[PDB]
Amino acid sequence: TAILYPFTISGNDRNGNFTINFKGTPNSTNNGCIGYSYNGDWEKIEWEGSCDGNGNLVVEVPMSKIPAGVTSGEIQIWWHSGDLKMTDYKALEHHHH
């Protein structure tokens, strides 16, 4: 039961990380990706992790994994053993709550 969150980025700036905060069922098992179209073809930077006792999960990916010229994509949740939602993401110095 996939969940998709669209995003837009600069095509040029690639310093730092793409950081995602999720809230979900404590101790849940979760995975997904950061996906994007690269010259029309879909590529995926997979992520996985378990929520802590408070139900929080932070995912970090280097921005350098997204090729130059890419301007849009989706944060995707794939597997979630309980509940999971994106509460914030940060890329290229910009938070999105």
Ligand X SMILES: OC[C@H]1O[C@@H](O[C@H]2[C@H](O)[C@H](O)[C@H](O[C@H]3[C@H](O)[C@H](O)[C@H](O[C@H]4[C@H](O)[C@H](O)[C@H](O[C@H]5[C@H](O)[C@H](O)[C@H](O)O[C@@H]5CO)O[C@@H]4CO)O[C@@H]3CO)O[C@@H]2CO)[C@@H](O)[C@@H](O)[C@@H]1O
Residues within the interface to ligand X (CB under 6 A): 2, 4, 29, 31, 33, 35, 42, 44, 74, 76, 78-79
**In this complex, which beta carbon is closest to ligand X, that of residue 33 or of residue 86?**
33
**In this complex, which beta carbon is closest to ligand X, that of residue 2 or of residue 68?**
2
For the chain, the C-alpha Rg in angstroms (whole number) is 13
Question: Cα(81)–Cα(78) distance, rounded to whole angstroms?
Answer: 10
- Tell me which DSSP letter residue 50 carries: E
CB of 15 to ligand X, least distance (A): 25
CB of 58 to ligand X, least distance (A): 18
- Nearest to 35, CA basis, from 76, 94, 89, 88: 76
- List CB contacts of 13: < 8 A, sequence separation 6 or more: 63, 92
CB of 71 to ligand X, least distance (A): 14
**In this complex, which beta carbon is closest to ligand X, that of residue 5 or of residue 16?**
5
